[PDB]
Chains A and B, each alone.
Chain A
Amino acid sequence: MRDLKTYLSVAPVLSTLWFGSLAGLLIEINRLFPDALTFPF
């Protein structure tokens, strides 16, 4: 549906999806590599 796809492009829904994916990625990254203080490579 075109009208359903239009509602998914509104600012709050897109922001929520983007930030949820971002937070998931950051949480997983910190889970894999915990307690990082310096860049060792």
Chain B
Amino acid sequence: LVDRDPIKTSFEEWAKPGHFSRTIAKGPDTTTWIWNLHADAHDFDSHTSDLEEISRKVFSAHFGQLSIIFLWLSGMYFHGARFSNYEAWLSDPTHIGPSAQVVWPIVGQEILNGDVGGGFRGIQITSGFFQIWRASGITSELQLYCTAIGALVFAALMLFAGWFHYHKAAPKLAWFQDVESMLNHHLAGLLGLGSLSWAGHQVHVSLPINQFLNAGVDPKEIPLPHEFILNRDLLAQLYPSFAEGATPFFTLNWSKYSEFLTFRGGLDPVTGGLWLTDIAHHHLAIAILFLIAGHMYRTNWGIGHGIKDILEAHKGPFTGQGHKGLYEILTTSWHAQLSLNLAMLGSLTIIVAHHMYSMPPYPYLATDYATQLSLFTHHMWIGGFLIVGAAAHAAIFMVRDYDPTNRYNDLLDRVLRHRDAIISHLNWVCIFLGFHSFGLYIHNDTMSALGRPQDMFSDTAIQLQPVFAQWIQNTHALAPGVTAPGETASTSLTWGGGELVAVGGKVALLPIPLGTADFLVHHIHAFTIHVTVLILLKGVLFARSSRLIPDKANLGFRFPCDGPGRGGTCQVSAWDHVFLGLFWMYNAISVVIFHFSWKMQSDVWGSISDQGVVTHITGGNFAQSSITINGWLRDFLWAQASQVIQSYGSSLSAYGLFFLGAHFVWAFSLMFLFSGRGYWQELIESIVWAHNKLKVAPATQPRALSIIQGRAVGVTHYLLGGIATTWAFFLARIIAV
């Protein structure tokens, strides 16, 4: 199912911009043509109506994405070998700050090459690559150079594959629609075999090298990874069970492998991370489970399941026919699959962000506060963006590919017939949550201002205790020995076990208390999430029609309005709902990251002394100061911003410059959001007049930006400015202290 040489390789189409569209290829009468060229670059569905060609175009771009990712990985690995102090950091991870970037001295920018330890001058990095390299057994820079070379080779291979599968042998449509085979392969081979290979690498390389490192041996005296394979005596000395070979595995005497395959739980006191034996056992079990899961769906040999057969058998007295017809929708529309995958990926990213901080998987990662904060905020933002994109593409599918005549589905029909109740109930829930979550903050502020601290919602006057979460913490703290007999310690130290882990005089992790403030902040999170969901679902559900504009589907997915009639019809399209929900996503993620930062700085992170007294960074003021808006403004925003505003003249002045630059970018966006196109089109007419006077009027007539373009520019600049401000503030605050 491939075609030989579908499209000739030529430079002819390079010299004719806009060849993908008939209208754009005509020529640039005005300046709107240039903007329209870029906005429709990757909309393959608008270029042609053939599903096979769209699938072939989609298949090739992923190869370019993979090549770009491989180039990025190659650069990251190469910079750590040539412009880094990784070897010096390896001998003292607790007193040296990782750095992998140096700057050329031209205009006085060499001040950014601050001292970081190990006789090195550079920029301190917070991506956590040093911990990953240490956990993999990497010791010298030659291995990093080899990894960079391999990544370059893989990027070249990906680029060649991308060219080949589009210009020499393009698969047919019947190849793409083999969902059962694709699922079987991506489950058994992509995931299970990868987990098995990583488990093997961890067993044979990471474990002995990491044990030698934790023993305190000089990294230059540790035997090379290949010495543990050729010389089984070394492994037998390290692990006696290796002397028996693979015989216990094939005789089901798996108890002999308990030395390097454990079920301990908790953190390693030496490094502050999870035990590597637990990780190896976890990867082995996950590989087995994924290998089993990949033999469910039917193929050329009869045995297995048919996804259509599974779907068609589920229906209920409330839902009618049920899931019949969903198989044909998901195997014919690219947008629905994209929306579902984007939503699932965003949720998974948020879950990963939440899980990484409380269960540190890398050595010397819990005590690196900047890395933890950066990873948390980065992954949360990525998850939010993916979640928004899911709804955007769901609306796109609803507008374009919906067709009840040939693709009828009962479940989709029933949802669209009672959307008013869903929207009204969601509106009521949002209003109730906003009143009963944010209103308690204003009450506390008013009572504090009036001089009545005894009438506030606080731990000392009127308690609002999160009794349900405390019960979960108590249950999980008592899990070992009762409901998890095979475990020695709890999964996390934050459950409330009472034990504290200190590495290098710093607090890695300890139980986290929950009080009245956590109740309020959690309900604030719920309120913001509910409002965002309301906006996106209202946008998706009313994409085709409404009581105001019955024929909204004919106007398309991205149109500005339908005139000033009916009192005003501004921003009625589904695109405008995504444009509006991006702001609320930004708001929710900012509140969440502020909560995380303040809570960790106030109740977890700190230093321990010889007598064992913990002194936190901010002194534990979160409980009594976060219950008012004035407290958030004073003890968090005003107090913690002194690091970034006093960074001039030092190696951290770049963050100080980025603070003001992001301020300017954020403030600059309000011009596009608060104004309209007619004023700017009328203003241009006067500017064109004087150019005509001096014979400098261009033939490409200048036109003001369209309404949609202006809204997009405004939202983009707004988001960029806000995120850059928060990034600069966080990094400047956390690197110094």
Contact = CB atoms under 8 A, between A and B. Distances in A.
**A–B contact at 8 Å CB threshold (below):** yes
Interface of A: 1, 3-4, 6-7, 10, 27, 30-31, 34
B737 interface: no
Contact of A3 (B14, B17, B106, B107): B14
B499 interface: no
A4 B14 contact: yes
Contact of B106 (A1, A4, A6, A30): A30
Nearest to A1: B11
B12 interface: yes
A34 B17 CA distance: 43
B637 to A, nearest CB: 38
B39 interface: no
Nearest to A28: B106
A7 B106 contact: no
B38 to A, nearest CB: 10
- Among B10, B14, B15, chain A packs the most CB atoms within 10 A around the CB of B15
Q: Which 3 A-B pairs have the closest CB atoms?
A: A6-B15, A3-B11, A7-B14
B15 to A, nearest CB: 4
B17 A10 contact: yes
Contacts of A31: 106
Contact of A30 (B11, B12, B17, B107): B107
B17 to A, nearest CB: 7
A27 to B, nearest CB: 6
Interface string B13-26: 01101000000000
A4 B11 contact: yes
Contacts of B106: 27, 30-31
19 contacts: A1-B11, A3-B10, A3-B11, A3-B12, A3-B14, A3-B15, A4-B11, A4-B14, A6-B14, A6-B15, A7-B11, A7-B14, A7-B15, A10-B17, A27-B106, A30-B106, A30-B107, A31-B106, A34-B107
A27 B12 CA distance: 37
A4 B9 CA distance: 13
Contacts of A3: 10-12, 14-15
A6 B106 CA distance: 37
A6 B12 CA distance: 10
A11 B17 CA distance: 11
Contacts of B14: 3-4, 6-7
Interface in B91-148: 106-107
Interface string B70-83: 00000000000000
Interface in B1-56: 10-12, 14-15, 17
A27 B106 CA distance: 8
A25 to B, nearest CB: 13
Contacts of B11: 1, 3-4, 7
A22 B14 CA distance: 26
Contacts of A10: 17
Contacts of A1: 11
Contacts of B107: 30, 34
Interface in B369-420: none
Nearest to B34: A11
Given A3-B14, A7-B14, 13 more contacts: A3-B10, A3-B11, A3-B12, A3-B15, A4-B11, A4-B14, A6-B14, A6-B15, A7-B11, A10-B17, A30-B106, A30-B107, A31-B106
A18 to B, nearest CB: 18
Contacts of B15: 3, 6-7
Interface string B552-595: 00000000000000000000000000000000000000000000
B25 to A, nearest CB: 15
